[PDB]
Amino acid sequence: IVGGYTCGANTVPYQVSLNSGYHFCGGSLINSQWVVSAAHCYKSGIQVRLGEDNINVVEGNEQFISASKSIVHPSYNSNTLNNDIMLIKLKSAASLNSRVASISLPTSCASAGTQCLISGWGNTKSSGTSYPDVLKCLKAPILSDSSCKSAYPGQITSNMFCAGYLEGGKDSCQGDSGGPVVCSGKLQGIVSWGSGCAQKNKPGVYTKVCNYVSWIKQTIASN
């Protein structure tokens, strides 16, 4: 997260870190057994780390649970990033509490102008590299579909939306991939892609979670 703020330990209780020897992506806990992330975060050997603040220090609220199964969306295209969503099932159920909590799925899509919270352990610099230990947060509005498409000609599908600041300076970045965009208490987005980070006229692009709720629910119901 570039241009954000330190969230505060365990204040984003649905935020997970996906770990394969190191943090490599975010995700969102949606029930005691399941995490939603980006399809571009797929790899084998994932350990889901819940209750994290400092990802390099055991602080006492973590739960570390290995994935039993990953399900990339059937229509994910890794060249265009269309349908950039994946589900991860935990080998055992997380113990839910005030610091490890699921985030509600949307019942309808969110509108341009809605304020959201984007979070992760990604790079905090737009030119250069610095990776934080503690979770970073950014409040950002959803942008209009028209401004999103104008910013990224030929690339925005009906399964994507932009959020952030056309002036630059505030954005998600590398390592925030797969993490949450939460608006009015609902998971509306997943950190998906963008041109650089925090660049003028190049806002972050996010998977439009509301399009996937039926797939998520039916997948959970049979897996």
Ligand SMILES: COc1ccc2[nH]cc(CCN)c2c1
């Ligand atoms: C865009 O950066 C990342 C970062 C972490 C990642 N893990 C696995 C993948 C590729 C998915 N098959 C990936 C990509």
Ligand SMILES: COc1ccc2[nH]cc(CCN)c2c1
């Ligand atoms: C500019 O390099 C990267 C590298 C990896 C990334 N993952 C997601 C994003 C977009 C964040 N808005 C991103 C950007």
Ligand SMILES: [Ca+2]
């Ligand atoms: Ca920790």
